[PDB]
Amino acid sequence: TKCTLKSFTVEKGIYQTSNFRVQPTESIVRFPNITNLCPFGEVFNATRFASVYAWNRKRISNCVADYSVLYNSASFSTFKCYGVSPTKLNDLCFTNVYADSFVIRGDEVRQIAPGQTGTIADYNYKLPDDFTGCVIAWNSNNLDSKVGGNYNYLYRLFRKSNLKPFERDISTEIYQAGSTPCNGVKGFNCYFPLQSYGFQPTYGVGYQPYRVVVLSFELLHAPATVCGPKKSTNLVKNKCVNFNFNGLTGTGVLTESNKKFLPFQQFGRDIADTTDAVRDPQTLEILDITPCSFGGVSVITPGTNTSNQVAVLYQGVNCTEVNVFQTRAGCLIGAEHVNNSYECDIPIGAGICASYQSIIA
Amino acid sequence: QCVNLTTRTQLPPAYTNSFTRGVYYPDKVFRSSVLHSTQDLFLPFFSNVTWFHAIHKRFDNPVLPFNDGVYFASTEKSNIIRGWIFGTTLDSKTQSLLIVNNATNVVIKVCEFQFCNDPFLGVYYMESEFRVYSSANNCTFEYVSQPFLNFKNLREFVFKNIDGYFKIYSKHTPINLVRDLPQGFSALEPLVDLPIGINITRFQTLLALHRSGWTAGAAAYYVGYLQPRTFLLKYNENGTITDAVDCALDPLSE
Amino acid sequence: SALGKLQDVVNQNAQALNTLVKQLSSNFGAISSVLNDILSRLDPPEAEVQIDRLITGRLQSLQTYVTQQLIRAAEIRASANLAATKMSECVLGQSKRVD
Amino acid sequence: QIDRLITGRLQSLQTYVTQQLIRAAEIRASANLAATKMSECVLGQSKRVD
Amino acid sequence: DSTECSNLLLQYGSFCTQLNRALTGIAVEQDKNTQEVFAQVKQIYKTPP
Amino acid sequence: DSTECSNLLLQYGSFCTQLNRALTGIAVEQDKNTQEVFAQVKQIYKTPPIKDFGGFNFSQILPDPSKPSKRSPIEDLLFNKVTNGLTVLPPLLTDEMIAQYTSALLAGTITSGWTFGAGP
Ligand SMILES: *[C@@H]1O[C@H](CO)[C@@H](O[C@@H]2O[C@H](CO)[C@@H](O)[C@H](O)[C@H]2NC(C)=O)[C@H](O)[C@H]1NC(C)=O
Numbered sequence: 064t065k066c067t068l069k070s071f072t073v074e075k076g077i078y079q080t081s082n083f084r085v086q087p088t089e090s091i092v093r094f095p096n097i098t099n100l101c102p103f104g105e106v107f108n109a110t111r112f113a114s115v116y117a118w119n120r121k122r123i124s125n126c127v128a129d130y131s132v133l134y135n136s137a138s139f140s141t142f143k144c145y146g147v148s149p150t151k152l153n154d155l156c157f158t159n160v161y162a163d164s165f166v167i168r169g170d171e172v173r174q175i176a177p178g179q180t181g182t183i184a185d186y187n188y189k190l191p192d193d194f195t196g197c198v199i200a201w202n203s204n205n206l207d208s209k210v211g212g213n214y215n216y217l218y219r220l221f222r223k224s225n226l227k228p229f230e231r232d233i234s235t236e237i238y239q240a241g242s243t244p245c246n247g248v249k250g251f252n253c254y255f256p257l258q259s260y261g262f263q264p265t266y267g268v269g270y271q272p273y274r275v276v277v278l279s280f281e282l283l284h285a286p287a288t289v290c291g292p293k294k295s296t297n298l299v300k301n302k303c304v305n306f307n308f309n310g311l312t313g314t315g316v317l318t319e320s321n322k323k324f325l326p327f328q329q330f331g332r333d334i335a336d337t338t339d340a341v342r343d344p345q346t347l348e349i350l351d352i353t354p355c356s357f358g359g360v361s362v363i364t365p366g367t368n369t370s371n372q373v374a375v376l377y378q379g380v381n382c383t384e385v386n387v388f389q390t391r392a393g394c395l396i397g398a399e400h401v402n403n404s405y406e407c408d409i410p411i412g413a414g415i416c417a418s419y420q421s422i423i424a
Numbered sequence: 425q426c427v428n429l430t431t432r433t434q435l436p437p438a439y440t441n442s443f444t445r446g447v448y449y450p451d452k453v454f455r456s457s458v459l460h461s462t463q464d465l466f467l468p469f470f471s472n473v474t475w476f477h478a479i480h481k482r483f484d485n486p487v488l489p490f491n492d493g494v495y496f497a498s499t500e501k502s503n504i505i506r507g508w509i510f511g512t513t514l515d516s517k518t519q520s521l522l523i524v525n526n527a528t529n530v531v532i533k534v535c536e537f538q539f540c541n542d543p544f545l546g547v548y549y550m551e552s553e554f555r556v557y558s559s560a561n562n563c564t565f566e567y568v569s570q571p572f573l574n575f576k577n578l579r580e581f582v583f584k585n586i587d588g589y590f591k592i593y594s595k596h597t598p599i600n601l602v603r604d605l606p607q608g609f610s611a612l613e614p615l616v617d618l619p620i621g622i623n624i625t626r627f628q629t630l631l632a633l634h635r636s637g638w639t640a641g642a643a644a645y646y647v648g649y650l651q652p653r654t655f656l657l658k659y660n661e662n663g664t665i666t667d668a669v670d671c672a673l674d675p676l677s678e
Numbered sequence: 679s680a681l682g683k684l685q686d687v688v689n690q691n692a693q694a695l696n697t698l699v700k701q702l703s704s705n706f707g708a709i710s711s712v713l714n715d716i717l718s719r720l721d722p723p724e725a726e727v728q729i730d731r732l733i734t735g736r737l738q739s740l741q742t743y744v745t746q747q748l749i750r751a752a753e754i755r756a757s758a759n760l761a762a763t764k765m766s767e768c769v770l771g772q773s774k775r776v777d
Numbered sequence: 778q779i780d781r782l783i784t785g786r787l788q789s790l791q792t793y794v795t796q797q798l799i800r801a802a803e804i805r806a807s808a809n810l811a812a813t814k815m816s817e818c819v820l821g822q823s824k825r826v827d
Numbered sequence: 828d829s830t831e832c833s834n835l836l837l838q839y840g841s842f843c844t845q846l847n848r849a850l851t852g853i854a855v856e857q858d859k860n861t862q863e864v865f866a867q868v869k870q871i872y873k874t875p876p
Numbered sequence: 877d878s879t880e881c882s883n884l885l886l887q888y889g890s891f892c893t894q895l896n897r898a899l900t901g902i903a904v905e906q907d908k909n910t911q912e913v914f915a916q917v918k919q920i921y922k923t924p925p926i927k928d929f930g931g932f933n934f935s936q937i938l939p940d941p942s943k944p945s946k947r948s949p950i951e952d953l954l955f956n957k958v959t960n961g962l963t964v965l966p967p968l969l970t971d972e973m974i975a976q977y978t979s980a981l982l983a984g985t986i987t988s989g990w991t992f993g994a995g996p
């Protein structure tokens with residue numbers, strides 16, 4: 064009070080000196096129930112993969128993509144992400160996800176990167192320099208190699224020009240290396256472009272089949288719908304917490320509500336357009352958001368010439384949320400309530416007055 | 425597969441009064457016993473809405489400009505109206521949106537379709553005729569959902585394209601009026617928001633033929649256009665919109 | 679409409695409080711009216727500017743509210759002084775003042 | 778540019794409205810005094826000095 | 828008459844409604860003042876000829 | 877609850893202190909207004925139990941013993957006919973005590989004339 068009044072002597076009276084703030088204790092982040100996961104089983108766990116030339120492209124939209132399941136797996140030898148980091152993949156959201164799947168050799172995994180060169184990048188699968196996404200590769204000698212030789216996997220070895228980024232060439236036209244026309248016959252100087260990798264189990268680690276899935280993340284002006292899973296912190300009621308319900312954030316006490324919402328409605332507003340009711344996304348129940356018990360802190364004191372005893376009034380604050388007496392004005396601490404009636408010396412409010420005789424109210 | 429329909433009877437389109445229909449919830453916010461003034465794409469009260477018929481020989485399936493939004497009213501019995509055609513050029517050059525309700529479910533697709541000049545479905549007296557497209561090349565979005573659906577049923581729909589979001593609001597109403605729109609109040613609940621992100625400037629209704637040539641089942645529908653204006657909506661104790669005021673209709677409502 | 683004078687004061691105070699609450703929903707030229715959205719969507723060099731715009735808009739609203747409350751307080755004080763004069767002169771005595 | 782002009786003109790208009798409210802309060806006090814003089818000096822004889 | 832100016836002005840909220848309400852209150856207050864001062868009789872008295 | 881907003885708000889100085897002090901002055905002014913209007917007597921007068929006033933009836937303005945609020949029927953009708961950092965401070969005098977002050981004034985002006993306003 065001396066600090067507020069800028070004086071070392073305080074006259075008898077009540078002085079509003081501060082404000083009592085209930086501090087938020089927990090953070091409650093409830094978003095919708097985790098449903099509709101992205102089809103990563105039909106990409107990674109596919110029974111057969113495509114060749115590098117006719118590489119499969121699967122467009123992934125309108126689902127929840129959990130990338131930590133992929134990142135924490137021990138079955139992948141390469142999980143190199145270009146243009147984004149794996150830790151924040153699970154938080155960001157993308158418009159569409161392109162999953163390109165193919166089989167290449169062990170020594171050819173390095174060529175699936177921005178800015179690289181080789182047969183695969185020049186003639187089979189070319190990645191842009193400005194590529195945002197992840198390259199995931201794992202050994203598949205168990206499935207894609209047979210003892211006689213698996214000749215179901217093919218690669219382009221010849222083309223007149225290099226491929227553009229994200230281009231597919233499935234043409235089986237005879238490559239013309241000379242001035243002479245090929246005329247469809249694999250004679251002198253005219254070779255067939257697509258050659259096969261004879262994948263056998265007894266091969267070296269640089270020649271064994273590797274299944275590669277390249278995920279391409281783009282953000283376009285359309286609404287982004289491939290989002291990562293959002294966790295749901297265990298709801299805490301009857302405490303002043305910071306709530307985040309479906310992107311609506313605030314601070315309040317969440318209590319049970321008797322308001323019956325219509326099924327399409329999620330939040331509740333009063334006359335002054337402030338959110339006072341909300342629907343929990345996990346469990347369809349209605350919660351009232353009562354603002355935390357902020358109040359004024361007033362100091363009731365006699366003159367410093369008389370005594371140094373003080374009392375504290377918390378305006379509009381119940382006594383259970385802070386010589387403690389409950390008044391309609393608020394909670395009064397430090398004053399002894401008496402049943403006798405005297406003249407008003409220091410006004411408290413709601414018919415309550417304080418006086419010095421100790422401090423009585 | 426496409427089939428030209430050449431047994432139509434030429435007739436000018438009709439017009440009628442909107443009364444106090446076309447109101448929808450502007451947001452997902454509960455409000456109790458309060459009056460809320462909102463600025464949004466709303467249908468004007470007592471406005472001139474275009475009336476199209478399907479009767480036998482009338483088969484009204486034209487292509488109309490979408491403008492800023494579409495209010496679709498349907499005085500429907502026996503489920504003739506099944507879906508809508510949304511797009512800009514309605515060919516494979518651009519990307520178009522298809523809404524269909526067949527005998528099992530509702531399918532919403534955003535793809536590069538080649539639309540027929542006369543697209544329709546068909547019921548044989550069993551649904552065994554689908555002639556609405558010839559191709560589907562590049563799909564961006566697919567969504568299969570639960571089915572939305574004297575004239576006995578009244579179906580109100582509001583379609584909006586805001587910030588790449590397609591809002592479909594709908595309401596089912598049990599009526600017993602024979603010919604025109606009934607006079608009353610019914611606020612349209614929000615049904616589904618679609619992340620489409622595409623340009624739409626034209627639309628076309630999809631009907632169903634009756635085969636036993638073809639016969640058109642008795643149906644009637646109404647097209648209204650959404651304009652940016654202010655409504656004063658009344659919310660009761662239970663939180664439903666029971667009445668509305670158009671701020672630009674007359675000085676009393678102003 | 680017998681008690682319209684008290685009802686006008688109650689309605690004016692409630693409407694002024696409601697307007698002061700509804701001024702929080704205005705961005706005042708900023709990208710959003712919510713401080714959390716600005717603090718989560720932008721870096722502090724531009725969030726400082728947006729928060730400054732929200733601060734000056736809300737401060738102008740609060741100054742306007744306090745000024746009109748002071749004017750209404752002066753009016754109510756004048757009415758209360760008149761009421762005290764009527765209490766002293768009409769109730770506690772007989773007044774010769776006409777009307 | 779319109780934001781600068783809007784905030785300047787809005788501050789000017791708010792200042793004008795505040796001055797008008799203060800002057801209206803003064804004129805209301807003067808009018809209440811004039812009504813009191815009309816009641817007590819014209820419609821009756823007043824014993825109040827000056 | 829600038830529509831862009833009004834669109835930017837709507838971001839500031841209901842300041843204009845407040846100012847119009849205050850001016851309307853002053854305008855009706857002036858008529859109330861004249862009514863209180865001069866209309867203290869409901870009978871129009873006339874002097875004899 | 878934004879700490880960055882408060883840090884930027886501290887650059888503007890003591891505007892908040894001026895606004896709080898002005899509102900505090902208005903709030904104490906309302907209590908002073910009520911004190912000046914209703915608390916003009918320091919003796920709480922009561923009417924006699926027998927209401928023999930020479931034919932004059934004051935039941936509509938005297939407090940009703942049947943009502944818990946101790947208001948007059950006219951005062952009861954008057955009370956029936958009136959219907960983010962924000963706090964509402966309660967008035968210093970409750971409605972019961974303001975009704976008690978009006979009851980004391982009515983008892984004084986009925987039983988004692990204008991004598992109670994000028995002395996005993
Ligand atoms: C149904 O009628 C429409 C309208 O004439 C036909 O659309 C025309 O198709 C021809 C195909 O050679 C085009 O050259 C015309 O430009 C089209 N006209 C319009 C207005 O689109 C449609 O082909 C007919 N259906 C069938 C199956 O013949």
Ligand SMILES: *[C@@H]1O[C@H](CO)[C@@H](O[C@@H]2O[C@H](CO)[C@@H](O)[C@H](O)[C@H]2NC(C)=O)[C@H](O)[C@H]1NC(C)=O
Nearest residue numbers: 926927928929931932933934935936937940949
């Ligand atoms: C004074 O007036 C009151 C009210 O006008 C009278 O009370 C009424 O008495 C009659 C006769 O029993 C009842 O029928 C009414 O219902 C009473 N009115 C109320 C409001 O209670 C009262 O009798 C009058 N006289 C005295 C001496 O008190």
Ligand SMILES: *[C@@H]1O[C@H](CO)[C@@H](O)[C@H](O)[C@H]1NC(C)=O
Nearest residue numbers: 103104107108132133136138
């Ligand atoms: C693919 O197979 C592995 C090996 O059993 C399994 O652990 C994993 O869950 C499967 N699915 C995905 C999406 O990786």
Ligand SMILES: *[C@@H]1O[C@H](CO)[C@@H](O)[C@H](O)[C@H]1NC(C)=O
Nearest residue numbers: 095096097098344345346347
């Ligand atoms: C959400 O999932 C939980 C189980 O994790 C289930 O008990 C609850 O009913 C679900 N709620 C909805 C709305 O689906």
Ligand SMILES: *[C@@H]1O[C@H](CO)[C@@H](O)[C@H](O)[C@H]1NC(C)=O
Nearest residue numbers: 438439440441470471472473
């Ligand atoms: C509706 O429009 C048609 C032509 O578009 C016009 O003839 C008719 O009078 C209009 N009705 C009303 C009520 O405006």
Ligand SMILES: *[C@@H]1O[C@H](CO)[C@@H](O)[C@H](O)[C@H]1NC(C)=O
Nearest residue numbers: 525526527528529531551568
């Ligand atoms: C309706 O369409 C969906 C999607 O094309 C299809 O799966 C379903 O079998 C169809 N039902 C009928 C009855 O045609």
Ligand SMILES: *[C@@H]1O[C@H](CO)[C@@H](O)[C@H](O)[C@H]1NC(C)=O
Nearest residue numbers: 516536559560561562563564
């Ligand atoms: C769209 O389809 C055409 C042919 O159907 C194809 O040539 C083109 O590459 C496709 N574009 C995209 C973006 O898929």
Ligand SMILES: *[C@@H]1O[C@H](CO)[C@@H](O)[C@H](O)[C@H]1NC(C)=O
Nearest residue numbers: 511512513622623624625626
């Ligand atoms: C949408 O389509 C219309 C008609 O084709 C065209 O005029 C308009 O420019 C298009 N808008 C966009 C954003 O492509």
Ligand SMILES: *[C@@H]1O[C@H](CO)[C@@H](O)[C@H](O)[C@H]1NC(C)=O
Nearest residue numbers: 457659660661662663664666
């Ligand atoms: C709300 O609904 C209940 C029954 O569901 C009904 O009794 C009550 O009257 C309704 N309230 C309003 C304001 O319509």
